[model samples]
Target: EVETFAFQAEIAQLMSLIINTFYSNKEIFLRELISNSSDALDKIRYESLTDPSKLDSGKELHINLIPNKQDRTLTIVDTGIGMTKADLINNLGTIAKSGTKAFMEALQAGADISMIGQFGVGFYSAYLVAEKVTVITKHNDDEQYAWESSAGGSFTVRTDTGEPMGRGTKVILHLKEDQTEYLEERRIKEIVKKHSQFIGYPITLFVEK
Candidate 1:
């Protein structure tokens, strides 16, 4: 409701360029998404180490991918510092934030021009090929919310419409026809290596069996 109201105009333009064309680097989205997820898991690991009471999993950080052949969809799910509603708005709305600034600073310092793992509305990139995207998320201190969008500002955030899932986040990308190449293991593996080979978390996927 109120969330749909006024926002900076540039952000909307940013959304179009981003969602429609600017990325150009097609294979990098998975890397960016996975890296961002690993960063979240890292945050949780770092926190739980100092405060065991926050522990949810007695295991190492990881990212999971599930590709549906018939559905032409991919689900990237991770358990970390699940986003509160405000966090979702603040984090998703802003995109790069500190990381983008820091990366620019480093570049200005003559460091390698590497884009930081700032999630940067990275979720919206699903629009590149997805006709639809469903974000199923569970956060601490509140009920789960499902945020769905076709990109741009028109998003609907509602209480989960299906059986409740536990804490964490799951992003389902409803890929379009032209981008179905993502449904293949060979292509997926190549993309992962090209962009995410050095990623800290072990990537898992439900491929054709």
Candidate 2:
């Protein structure tokens, strides 16, 4: 099932507030995204502890970064619990006060240096460096789907007729000018170590040479 949705009107204002107040540093976006991946991986792992056959059993939980300097694109792929179209709509479509719904329940809650995705704003940080973003994901209960947005306050999701991801998600950031520094493996390695070294799974940067 493919769908296009208009954001609930408040989303634009919410995003504006995030850009202005929450995330000024561009590099933090990578950490936030990787953290999201880590969370999803953890979710699936916990589930598998009970239901051993949740997904492709052979797949490993790892994150892969594929940087294409020529195309000005950086792709991050994770083998984790992927999203359905409905999850895309709710996760990316609305402000997801349920995200706030989620935050209030956690005891150590504060808008501090540690809380990046608490307000459902971390995914938006990709827009700081990408003109457009494409997400390809496959889940156990749903067909593989592709979602696209450009920070324009609206997004579209459609079934991906191409090959499946087996199980997980892939995010491709089409970089804006001056964002090319992220294309270098050395810089990516440094950022991953600085922010994501504690992440449980392996983070692999694809090297061409």
Candidate 3:
């Protein structure tokens, strides 16, 4: 068994860059997220076409949105490729493939860092708007793990207590009082379509009374 690592100094900088810069619209965090979902659906669809038996029969290529005004929480859920501990580390901890040196080299070479995906760290942007982010992921291959991050200094990871009902991922955003706009259903859906219109999947939303 392996243990999870804590965020380091550079991780702090990367978190600041993404939280402070990448999202000019702030609402665009939905866009970035939905974009990743679409990309995931595309990848799985291509794979399924190759292996007919591997098709995801019951699930739709849609992303789900749920909003809670009382709590100011919004959730974006998708049925796509699930992530593992390794994926967590590679995606959240450290920098992209080959460690921070490669990320630094890219900075020096002016590499189009946007082209990178396995560098799954961009999800950290949600922290800019939310007080905390909780991720629940189930893999086609392994058990689900729950990841929580405050990004001010620390985060926690534990074997998930809730079952991950299906494949792919769900990100729960606990919104800050001033960022309540994200919890508006209409605003969120539009943001998703604008960013993930091409995502070859079905997205669903749950409404509360």
Candidate 4:
């Protein structure tokens, strides 16, 4: 089953500002995405300290970048804490309503919330280089779900029946015509080295032979 949702008023406005005025460096989109994935990985690891089951056996913690030149798309996949259907709406459909913020607050201790940075808006940065964004995620507690949007007035969520994605999130960015540089292996490596070199997890880029 699939459902469509209109962007929250605040989110629609924030997206417009992000796409048009907020960022001058379009390359920052990759930085934002990588950071977000890092946070998700961190969250799962942190939670597993108390609840070992959260670790979900055999899932390695890492990030994968697949740039499809033929399709003009770049997909970033992570083995981290994934989102549920409601999470897709509340976290991505609204501005400032970040799950990371709530997670930090719930933990109460000094968990260094700053490490996650701005959560909600960071995801919107995908629009800077992508004409459309699709996220397929699977949470330990919820079935897989996919979210898609064009940074427009609305977005959609649907049950994902693709290959079994154990636990994590996959973000597919359909590059805008002018932003095809992101699909280049060397360019993506340059951006990652410059902005995300310090990320704690392994970020592997898949190069086709």
Candidate 5:
């Protein structure tokens, strides 16, 4: 089953501002995404402290970057606490409403509102380089679901019908034509080294020989 909903007005405005005015530092998109993945890893680890079953799979916490030239996509996978269907709607959707509201207020107040500093807005930065973004996630308590958006007026959340995934999230960015540079192994490695080298979890990139 799939359900579609339009983005909140503030979210649409935020996305437009991100994709347009946020062009100078497009590489930071990787940094923001990796940071989000790291946060998820931290969440599951913290949850396991009280409920050990959260780590029952014992899959080592890590992040993997897979760039597929053939498909023109960059996929980021993390073995971390994933989101439920409701989480998809809340986290990926309405959670940004309040943040963006404050952001707009700050802008009106003549304060600098860098996109990086705002809560929940970082995720939408995926639109900086992606024409479409797809998130497939599985939480321990719920069935897998996919959240998809083209940074348009609306997005969709549906029960994922693909192969079952372990507890975690996978974000696939369908790169825009001018942004395919992110699909390069060297480019990703450099960006990771520059920004995420100190991240606690292991981050691996698939390099085709």
Candidate 6:
């Protein structure tokens, strides 16, 4: 079953903060998301270094980016540590307590331009170009779950009874009308190489040629 929750008071403020901060540079949402994916992959890979069985045998770690022109959507999938239901809530449902908070505070304290990723709201930067976002993820100890929201403060999480993704996450971005340029291969390619080449795992882009 699926359930919905109203946005916490701080969540609303956080959304505004993100919008205000990234309003001028929407193209970097991909950069932020890819960075997050890399972080997740790094965490899992670090765990597997000690316990090889931490990873599923058949699953190779990588990131998949699929752009659908007809649907005006960009779906980013990663074979990494997926989130549990509670992880979803604490991560996306609250602000000031997020990984983004410290960085955001530093920014307020006159941090330099190089001071990005100081905290966690990197995920919320998706709102720069996405009107709605859907996250489907599966973790080892938790069943698959889907989180959906319009970046309007409130979000919903529900049990995903669909086919399992083995172990990882899929983020579907419903692009805003004016942000359709994100669906273009050349644009993403440039962005990927420019900003995310440091990604530890392979990132493959899927687009209909």
lDDT against the true structure, each candidate: 0.66, 0.77, 0.67, 0.81, 0.85, 0.79
Model 2 Cα lDDT, one tens digit per residue, 63-86: 999999888999999989989888
Question: For candidate 6, what is the lDDT?
Answer: 0.79
TM-score of each candidate structure, all chains considered together: 0.78, 0.84, 0.77, 0.85, 0.92, 0.88
- Once model 2 is optimally superposed onto the true structure by TM-score, how far is the C-alpha of residue 26 displaced, in angstroms? 0.4
Tens digits of lDDT, candidate 5, 137-163 = 999889989999997688899999997
How many Å off is the CA of 85 in candidate 3?
1.9
Which runs in model 3 stand beyond 4 Å of their true positions?
A: 1-4, 18-24, 50-59, 90-121
Q: Largest TM-score belongs to which candidate? A: 5
Best by lDDT: 5
> Candidate 6, TM-score vs. the true structure?
0.88
Please report the TM-score between candidate 2 and the true structure.
0.84
Taking the candidates one at a time, how many backbone clashes does each contain? Answer: 1, 0, 9, 0, 0, 4
In candidate 2, what residue range of length 10 has the lowest lDDT sum? Answer: 100-109
Lowest lDDT 10-residue stretch of candidate 3 = 112-121
TM-score (C-alpha, index-matched) for candidate 1: 0.78
Worst 10 residues of 5 by lDDT: 111-120
By TM-score, the better pick of 3 and 4 is 4
Q: lDDT of candidate 4 vs native?
A: 0.81
Model 3 lDDT per residue over 53-126, tens place: 44443355567888889878998877777677667755545444244445546656764434223345446557
Superposed Cα deviation of residue 56, candidate 4 (Å) = 2.5
Badly placed stretches (over 4 Å) of model 2 are 16-24, 91-95, 98-115
